């Protein structure tokens, strides 16, 4: 049998939010000039210039 007391509930959620998928779209990424690119040892990748 349907019982109103047993069926009435309060459903709770958030009022609103925005879900994002591409996090790296929020990063502004630039690179140095390749002439000045250095390696792990802090010296230029190509030194013969």
């Amino acid at each position: 049998q349907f019982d109103f007391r047993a069926s009435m509930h309060m459903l709770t959620s958030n009022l609103t939010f925005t879900v994002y998928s591409d996090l790296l779209a929020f990063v502004s990424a630039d690179t140095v000039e390749p002439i000045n690119a250095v390696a792990f040892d802090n010296m230029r990748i190509m030194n013969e210039l």
Partner: protein, 49 residues
């Protein structure tokens, strides 16, 4: 940031007996390395000083 190949290229061109089109860049940079070890001529060195 200065690639010195041009210098060496000009150098070879002024010897008038080589065809620089036949000279690879590695050879020109080896010439650069050998030239880099020589002292500068006295007049040129004093002008640069």
């Amino acid at each position: 940031q200065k690639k010195m190949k041009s210098i060496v290229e000009d150098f070879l061109k002024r010897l008038q007996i080589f065809d620089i089109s036949r000279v690879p860049d590695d050879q020109m940079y080896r010439l650069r390395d050998r030239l880099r070890l020589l002292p500068v001529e006295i007049r040129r060195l004093d002008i640069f000083n």
